[PDB]
Every structure is written in C-alpha cells, then in structure tokens.
Amino acid sequence: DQPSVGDAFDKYNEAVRVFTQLSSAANCDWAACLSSLSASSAACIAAVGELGLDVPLDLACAATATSSATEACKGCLW
Amino acid sequence: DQPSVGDAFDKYNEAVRVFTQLSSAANCDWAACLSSLSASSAACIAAVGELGLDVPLDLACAATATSSATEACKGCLW
Structure with missing residues (x-):
C-alpha cells in the first residue's frame, strides 16, 4: 500500500x-524479455486505463520484460 | 521489502x-510518456545490471513512462 506515486517508487525500488x-x-538475466517492455506491449497502455496501469497490463508488460518477472523468458532474471 | 519477484508483483500491483x-x-493521463517506456530507455536496460533493474534506470524508465511517475510528462498520470 503506497501513499503516493512518487513515494510509491521509493518503497517500490528497494x-x-x-x-x-x-x-x-543469482545466475543470469533474460535480457531479451526486458527489451520487450522497452519494446511495446498492448498491455502497458491498456493499462493506462485500468488502474495504475492495470498491473496485469503495465507491470505485467514490464514484468513480461524489464520490471522483470517474465516466466516466459526467465530462467534467469525474474 | 518483497520476499520474491513474482510475489513482489502481487504486493506491487495493489x-x-x-x-x-x-x-x-484524478483528472488525466500523460499517455505520451507511458509510450516512452514501451518505447525504450537506455536506463531500463542499464538497469538489468544495476539491481532489480536499478530502479533509477528501469522503474525510472518505466516511471518516466508507464510504471508511471514521470514528472516531465505528468501533470496528469503520476
């Protein structure tokens, strides 16, 4: 539960x-997937509209890449 | 303090x-900046190497866009 957006990050980051x-x-990074977020996911945007960027969309767009947590490209960077 | 990466998100999302x-x-979204993350920032990647993707880099790459918290394009979506 973050009190604000900017303040959220402080907590977030750590x-x-x-x-x-x-x-x-621990052992390795996917590297390829993170590029994917910095690439473009129909989610991160669809996210803009669905709540702090509908996590399933944005942070999932990011998790599916740089935010990092892509069970599809992982085996390294989660 | 998140216990894991995937579990982190659960907490993260909310x-x-x-x-x-x-x-x-509250009033509006930047929309333009979020595209920026899904665009590509020399940070989100430089992040891959500096800790969960050096927040100042990745979530900052994301904050500077979709993760949302770009004091540069905001005035709307922070």
Whole structure:
C-alpha cells in the first residue's frame, strides 16, 4: 500500500531492485524479455486505463520484460 | 521489502495500480510518456545490471513512462 506515486517508487525500488536482480545476480538475466517492455506491449497502455496501469497490463508488460518477472523468458532474471 | 519477484508483483500491483491511476483517474493521463517506456530507455536496460533493474534506470524508465511517475510528462498520470 503506497501513499503516493512518487513515494510509491521509493518503497517500490528497494522492493524491486532486490527482487529482479535476485534472479539475475543469482545466475543470469533474460535480457531479451526486458527489451520487450522497452519494446511495446498492448498491455502497458491498456493499462493506462485500468488502474495504475492495470498491473496485469503495465507491470505485467514490464514484468513480461524489464520490471522483470517474465516466466516466459526467465530462467534467469525474474 | 518483497520476499520474491513474482510475489513482489502481487504486493506491487495493489500498490502501483492505485498510485498511478490515482493521478489519472484524478483528472488525466500523460499517455505520451507511458509510450516512452514501451518505447525504450537506455536506463531500463542499464538497469538489468544495476539491481532489480536499478530502479533509477528501469522503474525510472518505466516511471518516466508507464510504471508511471514521470514528472516531465505528468501533470496528469503520476
């Protein structure tokens, strides 16, 4: 439960930075998938409309790539 | 502090989805910036290497766009 958007990140960061490199630092990064977010997903945008960017869409667009948590390209960076 | 990457998201989502649409639902979304993440930032990738994708890089690549928190394109979607 984040109090704000910018403040959310502060909390977010500590939480994510540790979570994703946890998988990479552990052994490897997908690298290909993250490009995918920075590529474009019909979700991250459809997200704009569905709540903080409908996580299933945006952070999922991101998780499916850089936010990192793509069970499809992982086996490395989750 | 997230226990895992996938589990992180569960927590994340509730936290973000509320934070970003908080700004949009409030009045408007940048829309242009979010495309920016789904576009490509030298950060989100440089992030892959600097911790869960160095928030200042990835979620900042995302915040500077879809994760949402771009004080540059905001005035709407933070």
